[PDB]
Every structure is written in structure tokens, then in C-alpha cells.
Amino acid sequence: PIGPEDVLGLQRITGDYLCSPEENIYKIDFVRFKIRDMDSGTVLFEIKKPPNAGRFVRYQFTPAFLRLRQVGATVEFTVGDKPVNNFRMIERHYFRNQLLKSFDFHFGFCIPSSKNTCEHIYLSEELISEMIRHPYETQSDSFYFVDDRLVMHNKADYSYS
Amino acid sequence: LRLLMLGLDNAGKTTILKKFTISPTLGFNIKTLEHRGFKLNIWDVGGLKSLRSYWRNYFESTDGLIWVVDSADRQRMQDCQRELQSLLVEERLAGATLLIFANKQDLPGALSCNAIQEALELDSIRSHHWRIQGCSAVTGEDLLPGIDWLLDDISSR
Numbered sequence: 345p346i347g348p349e350d351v352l353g354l355q356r357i358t359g360d361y362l363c364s365p366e367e368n369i370y371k372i373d374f375v376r377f378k379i380r381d382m383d384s385g386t387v388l389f390e391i392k393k394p395p396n397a398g399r400f401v402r403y404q405f406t407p408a409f410l411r412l413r414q415v416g417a418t419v420e421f422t423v424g425d426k427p428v429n430n431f432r433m434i435e436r437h438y439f440r441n442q443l444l445k446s447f448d449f450h451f452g453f454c455i456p457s458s459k460n461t462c463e464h465i466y467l468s469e470e471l472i473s474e475m476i477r478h479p480y481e482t483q484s485d486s487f488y489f490v491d492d493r494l495v496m497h498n499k500a501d502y503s504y505s
Numbered sequence: 506l507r508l509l510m511l512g513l514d515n516a517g518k519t520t521i522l523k524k525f526t527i528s529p530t531l532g533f534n535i536k537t538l539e540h541r542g543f544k545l546n547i548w549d550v551g552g553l554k555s556l557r558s559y560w561r562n563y564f565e566s567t568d569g570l571i572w573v574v575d576s577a578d579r580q581r582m583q584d585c586q587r588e589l590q591s592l593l594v595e596e597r598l599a600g601a602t603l604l605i606f607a608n609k610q611d612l613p614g615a616l617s618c619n620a621i622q623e624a625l626e627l628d629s630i631r632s633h634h635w636r637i638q639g640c641s642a643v644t645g646e647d648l649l650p651g652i653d654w655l656l657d658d659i660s661s662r
């Protein structure tokens with residue numbers, strides 16, 4: 345059973361999903377993701393859905409994405425019957441197996457049967473140039489823990505052509 | 506910094522979170538942000554009767570407690586008073602600075618700040634720093650100055 349400390353020192357994207365979707369006995373379900381340019385107020389990306397492979401998104405961003413000063417990332421998720429203690433996300437972003445950013449966020453308690461929201465209001469010229477040249481080599485792993493137990497692993501790659 | 510935003514259902518907590526297309530919160534809304542050179546993590550927890558026993562699940566580590574009042578909801582002020590005083594005796598909130606937003610000041614019969622101060626029994630409070638601040642959450646009026654004061658007070662510690 346993988347834990348936070350197990351993914352905090354990873355130096356590359358994982359070649360495989362680190363838990364089976366059955367691990368998700370809390371029925372944490374992401375039903376909406378939205379990304380906003382805080383300067384112009386343009387929605388850059390939105391995906392919605394009611395209410396060991398896990399989830400995957402291939403994002404289609406522009407070269408300008410990488411020059412933005414401020415972005416807002418919103419998540420909505422519903423939760424099942426059981427309480428969820430110590431809900432926690434670690435998200436690691438890699439370009440060509442070289443860590444770019446790590447986000448470690450402690451959501452806390454999730455009330456049984458809830459719809460919850462989290463909004464986060466959050467680069468070298470050679471890095472920008474290489475990332476625009478090499479689509480889908482920017483990759484991310486999102487790990488969700490519940491009381492230090494991995495229950496969900498989502499993956500993503502990114503384009504900036 | 507960790508801020509916890511509570512009050513009765515319909516008080517305008519979520520409206521506040523969003524302004525500083527809207528629905529009753531059956532669970533929470535977190536907003537995370539840089540302001541006055543601080544990383545602010547804010548939890549807007551729902552206020553309908555049956556969510557309230559789960560409030561205590563967000564007490565730990567709170568620096569700043571925003572209590573939000575529908576100032577026209579005069580039939581429920583005493584429930585609001587009642588809910589507030591409980592929080593204040595909870596050991597996990599021993600630290601917190603208290604900011605009261607007396608919301609919906611735009612509504613014709615909105616109780617004044619002073620009326621709310623008397624009704625909520627704010628003078629009884631010996632043990633947390635506090636400020637009552639009128640606002641209309643729908644307009645954006647009087648929110649930041651309210652928060653700004655919260656952070657400065659927390660910032661002294």
C-alpha cells in the first residue's frame with residue numbers, strides 16, 4: 345500500500361498505475377476540472393461529468409500557456425457513504441523525466457455523500473522552447489491518499505504546440 | 506495561514522468565498538490563494554443543520570475563523586448566536602482570530618452591526634480577537650478590508 349513518503353522522492357513519471365481503481369472504496373469521483381487565465385479571465389480548459397489502469401487526460405495547451413502569470417485550477421468531486429479522513433493529493437510534473445513542480449495538498453476531512461470543491465490560484469527560455477518543441481513529453485502523476493493510503497492515481501501529458 | 510468560514514445555511518458564506526450560478530454547499534469549498542504576502546488556505550463548509558456536527562472536522566490548525574451572518578434572518582439570530590458561542594469554547598479554536606461578516610446589509614431589514622453585536626453576544630468574548638464588519642456579499646462591498654484586518658491580526662499572532 346503506497347503512501348505519501350513513497351511518491352515524494354520519485355524522480356520520474358511512473359511507467360505504471362500504482363493502485364487499482366478498486367482501492368477507491370471511498371468512491372471519490374472527480375466530476376469537474378476547470379483552468380482559468382487569471383489575467384484575461386479565459387477558461388483554458390474544462391471537463392465535466394455527472395454526478396490497474398486509472399484515469400488519463402492529454403491536455404492541449406498553447407505556447408502562451410507557459411508565459412502566464414496566474415492561473416486558477418478548480419476541482420469538484422463527490423464522495424461516497426463512508427467518511428474520508430485526511431484526504432490528500434500529491435501531484436508531480438515532469439518534462440523528459442526531470443521533475444518540474446510538486447504540489448502536496450491536504451484537503452482534510454470529507455463528509456459522507458458530499459459534493460466538494462477546491463480552487464487553487466497559483467520558467468527558463470530553454471525550458472519553454474524545449475517544451476513547445478516536444479509535445480506529450482511533459483507528463484504528470486496525481487496521487488490521492490486517504491489516511492496515508494493511495495486510493496487513486498491519475499495520469500496526464502501535455503502539449504504546448 | 507488557514508481560515509475557516511462557517512455560519513448557518515443561506516448566510517452567504519460561499520458567495521463571500523467567490524467574490525473577494527451558486528448552490529447550497531453539501532460539503533466544502535476550498536479556495537487557496539496568495540494575498541498580503543501570505544498563502545491563504547480557506548475552507549467554506551456548508552451550514553445546513555446536518556452538516557454542523559461535521560464542522561469540528563476542520564477545527565484543527567485554524568488561524569482565522571470567519572463567521573457569516575444573514576443580517577436579515579432575524580428569526581434565526583438566536584440559533585446563530587447559539588452556534589457561534591459553541592465554536593468559541595472549542596479547544597481546537599483556542600488560537601483563532603474571529604471575523605464576523607454581517608452580510609446582506611443591502612436587504613431592507615438588514616440588522617445593523619450594533620444590533621448584531623448585541624444579538625450575538627460579542628462582548629462576552631474575553632479570549633479571541635474579533636471584529637464585526639457589515640457587507641453586501643453580492644456587491645463585493647466591504648469584504649477585503651474585513652479580511653485584510655483578519656490577516657494583520659493573525660500576523661501579530
Ligand SMILES: Nc1nc2c(ncn2[C@@H]2O[C@H](COP(=O)(O)OP(=O)(O)NP(=O)(O)O)[C@@H](O)[C@H]2O)c(=O)[nH]1
Nearest residue numbers: 514515516517518519520529530552609641642643
Ligand atoms: N441580497 C443579498 N443576497 C445575498 C448576499 N450574500 C449572499 N446572498 C444570497 O444568499 C443566497 C445563499 O448564498 P450562499 O452564498 O450560497 O450561502 P451559503 O451560506 O454559502 N449557503 P450554505 O451554508 O448552504 O453553504 C444566494 O441567493 C445569494 O445570492 C448579500 O449580500 N445580499
Ligand SMILES: [Mg+2]
Nearest residue numbers: 518519530551
Ligand atoms: Mg455555501
